[PDB]
């Protein structure tokens, strides 16, 4: 049951700094190195660091160099990455992974955590807007826009996750105006509507936004 | 640094069939010291295959690598819907680590014709001062579609984006949304709104439209 979890991503303003995370469980962490791999929205991954069992040894991409320290805790089990000078091109989902021998770069990453994404950038917060795209006057089409907000992400469901069947969340858009937007649709039975309740469900942690969206003919 | 380089770019094959992807280095090295990684979107990589072709935790014996010098192979035996993914090669025999750019393998299934429909900007969004026009076109494959859009038969250039899914998880299709934004004066002084769509699995372009306050 290896777990590997980060934490500390983020928006930040270019020059800025961030401390990443990664709690680990489910191996002995003091054998093993430790690596950060990164990928840029829509791009290939890329290794960014990488750091001995006991922390004598620790490894850049050329890229990072000087900006970026990789270090451990053995006794806390967590990986950390301090990120200071930060760049627009250092906007990523940073993956902490677990190396298989206790030599830094130079093994197959056999554990990886989900990420944690860096969004490096100028631009506020901002929560969106939710409006309807109401079914029209035997299967209809409705949903929900989720306009104007920065930064990634936003999650939808629908009917608190009681409906599944015939989702569609569309990956969000990069507006002209540099904010996203993104549609969710669902399609569903005709002689529902009116009768049937549908609710999408939209959260925007980024500036604590939540909410439910009725949407009716 | 090595360079690798992943060929094709984007595979589409069959459920049942073989995949056959392809990872090209720029200095020839050793096959102990390659690994392959498999991501699924909204997902971490993880561990497929390596050095050169022994098996993670949970990996199918139908994943088998092959091929020494500066060719390597990643051979994918009947092709399961999950095995669809984007597949990265990397070696760590040398400083520094490096990736192939990823070979992103795509399901192919029947031509079929997506369902269109168009919905206008809500009163709410027209209250909040801006208007976007949407057209949906659902589950289609492939993915080649082009969406026109016109307001009172001006055909609308430059004006609208779109966003396409990723492959559904049953039936292998794709769905669209094209966004037209225009101000809300401009929305409000004209009249037709439509969305006229062309694809392979329709005869002929499919056009859904409305006309506002009708
Ligand atoms: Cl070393
Ligand atoms: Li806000
Ligand atoms: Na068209």
């Known amino acids: 049951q290896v777990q590997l979890v980060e934490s500390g991503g983020g928006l930040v303003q270019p020059g800025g700094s961030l401390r990443l995370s990664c709690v680990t469980s489910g191996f002995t962490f003091r054998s093993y190195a430790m690596t950060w791999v990164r990928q840029a929205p829509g791009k290939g991954l890329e290794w960014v660091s990488s750091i001995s069992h006991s922390g004598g040894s620790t490894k850049y991409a050329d890229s990072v160099k000087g900006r970026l320290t990789i270090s451990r805790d053995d006794s806390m089990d967590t990986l950390y990455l301090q990120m200071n000078s930060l760049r627009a091109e250092d906007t990523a989902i940073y993956y902490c992974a677990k190396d298989q021998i206790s030599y830094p770069a130079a093994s197959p990453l056999d554990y990886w955590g989900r990420g944690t994404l860096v969004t490096v950038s100028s631009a506020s917060t901002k929560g969106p807007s939710v409006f309807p795209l109401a079914p029209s006057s035997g299967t209809a089409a409705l949903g929900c826009l989720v306009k104007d907000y920065f930064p990634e992400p936003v999650t939808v469901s629908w009917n608190s996750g009681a409906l599944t069947s015939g989702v569609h969340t569309f990956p969000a858009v990069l507006q002209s105006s540099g904010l996203y937007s993104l549609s969710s649709v669902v399609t569903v039975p005709s002689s529902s509507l009116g009768t049937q309740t549908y609710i999408c469900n939209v959260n925007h942690k980024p500036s604590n936004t939540k909410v439910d969206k009725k949407v009716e003919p | ?214």
């Open chain 2, 1 to 214: 640094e090595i360079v690798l380089t992943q060929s094709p770019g984007t595979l589409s094959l069959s459920p049942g069939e073989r995949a056959t992807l392809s990872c090209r280095a720029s200095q020839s090295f050793s096959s102990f010291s390659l690994a392959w990684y498999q991501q699924k979107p909204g997902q971490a990589p993880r561990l497929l295959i390596y050095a050169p072709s022994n098996r993670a935790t949970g990996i199918a014996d139908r994943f088998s690598g092959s091929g020494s010098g500066t060719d390597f192979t990643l051979t994918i035996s009947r092709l399961e819907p999950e095995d669809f993914a984007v597949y990265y090669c990397q070696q760590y025999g040398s400083s520094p680590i490096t990736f192939g750019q990823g070979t992103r393998l795509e399901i192919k299934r029947t031509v079929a014709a997506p369902s269109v429909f168009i919905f206008p900007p809500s009163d709410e969004q027209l209250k909040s001062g801006t208007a976007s026009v949407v057209c949906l076109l659902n589950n289609f494959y492939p993915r080649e579609a082009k969406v026109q859009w016109k307001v009172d038969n001006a055909l609308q250039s430059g004006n609208s984006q779109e966003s396409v899914t990723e492959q559904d998880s049953k039936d292998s299709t794709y769905s669209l949304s094209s966004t037209l934004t225009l101000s809300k004066a401009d929305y409000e002084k004209h009249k037709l709104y439509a969305c006229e769509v062309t694809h392979q699995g329709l005869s002929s372009p499919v056009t859904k439209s409305f006309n506002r306050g009708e």
